[PDB]
CSV table of C-alpha atoms in Angstrom, one decimal:
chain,number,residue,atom,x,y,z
T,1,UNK,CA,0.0,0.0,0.0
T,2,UNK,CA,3.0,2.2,-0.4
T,3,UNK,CA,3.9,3.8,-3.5
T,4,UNK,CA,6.7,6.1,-4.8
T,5,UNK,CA,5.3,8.5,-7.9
T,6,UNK,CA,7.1,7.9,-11.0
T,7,UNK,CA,6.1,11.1,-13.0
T,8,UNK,CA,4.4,14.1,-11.9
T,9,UNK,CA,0.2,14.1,-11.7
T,10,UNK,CA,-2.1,17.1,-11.6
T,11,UNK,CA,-5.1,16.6,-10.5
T,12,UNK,CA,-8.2,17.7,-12.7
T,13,UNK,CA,-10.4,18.3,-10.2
T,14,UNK,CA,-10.7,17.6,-6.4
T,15,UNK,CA,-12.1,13.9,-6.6
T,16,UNK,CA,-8.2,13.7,-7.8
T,17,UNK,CA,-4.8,13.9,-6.2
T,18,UNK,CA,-2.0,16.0,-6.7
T,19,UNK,CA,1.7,15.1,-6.6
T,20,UNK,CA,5.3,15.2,-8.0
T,21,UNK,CA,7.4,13.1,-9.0
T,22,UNK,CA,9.3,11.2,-5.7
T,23,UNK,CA,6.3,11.8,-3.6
T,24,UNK,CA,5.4,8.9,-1.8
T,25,UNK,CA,1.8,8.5,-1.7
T,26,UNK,CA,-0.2,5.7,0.5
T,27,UNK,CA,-2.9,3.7,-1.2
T,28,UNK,CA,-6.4,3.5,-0.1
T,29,UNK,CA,-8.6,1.8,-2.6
T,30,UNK,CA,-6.9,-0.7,-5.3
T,31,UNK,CA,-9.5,-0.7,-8.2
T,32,UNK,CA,-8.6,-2.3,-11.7
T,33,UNK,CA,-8.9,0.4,-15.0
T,34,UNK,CA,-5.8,2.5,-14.3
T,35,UNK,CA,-7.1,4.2,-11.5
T,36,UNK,CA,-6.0,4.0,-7.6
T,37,UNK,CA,-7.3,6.1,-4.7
T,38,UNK,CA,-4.4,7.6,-1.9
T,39,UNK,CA,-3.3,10.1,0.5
T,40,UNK,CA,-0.5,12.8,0.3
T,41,UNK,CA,0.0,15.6,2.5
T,42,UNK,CA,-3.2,15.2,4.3
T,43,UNK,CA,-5.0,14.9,0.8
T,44,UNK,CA,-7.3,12.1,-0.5
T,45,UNK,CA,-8.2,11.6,-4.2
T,46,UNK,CA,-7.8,9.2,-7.2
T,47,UNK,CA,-4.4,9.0,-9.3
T,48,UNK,CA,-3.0,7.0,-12.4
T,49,UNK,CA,-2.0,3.2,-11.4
T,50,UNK,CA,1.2,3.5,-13.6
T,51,UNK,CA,2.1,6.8,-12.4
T,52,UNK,CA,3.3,5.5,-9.1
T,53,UNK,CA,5.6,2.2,-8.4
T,54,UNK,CA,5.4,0.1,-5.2
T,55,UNK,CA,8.0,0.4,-2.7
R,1,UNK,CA,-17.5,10.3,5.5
R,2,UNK,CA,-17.9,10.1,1.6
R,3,UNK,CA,-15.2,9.1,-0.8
R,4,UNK,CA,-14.6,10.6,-3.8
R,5,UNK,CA,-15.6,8.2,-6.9
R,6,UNK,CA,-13.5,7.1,-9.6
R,7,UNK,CA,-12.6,9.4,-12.1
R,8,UNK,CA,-15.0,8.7,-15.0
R,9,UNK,CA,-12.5,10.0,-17.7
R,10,UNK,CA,-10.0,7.7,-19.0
R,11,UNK,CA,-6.7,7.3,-17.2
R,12,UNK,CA,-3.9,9.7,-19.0
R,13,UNK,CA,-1.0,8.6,-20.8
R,14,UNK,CA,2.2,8.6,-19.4
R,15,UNK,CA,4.4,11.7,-20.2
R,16,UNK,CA,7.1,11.0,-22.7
């Protein structure tokens, strides 16, 4: 449930999550289609799967 | 408290 971002992701709207690359972002919902939820910095939103590797 | 749902949209590529 530990991830490491891989590129940088800005977030569309505020059902997403922000973050740049090396930001190391905790994962709250796995879901299958290219999109994970997780929290960084107190923030709580979706994200791309292959954005992100596991650590 | 409520979750935000899935993003509808289709995931974005990679940047290259």
């Amino acid at each position: 449930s530990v991830v490491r971002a891989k590129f940088n992701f800005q977030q569309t709207n505020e059902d997403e999550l922000s973050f740049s690359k090396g930001d190391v972002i905790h994962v709250t919902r796995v879901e299958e289609g290219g999109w994970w939820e997780g929290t960084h910095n107190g923030r709580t939103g979706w994200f791309p799967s292959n954005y992100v590797r596991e650590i | 408290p409520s979750r935000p749902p899935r993003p509808s949209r289709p995931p974005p590529p990679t940047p290259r």
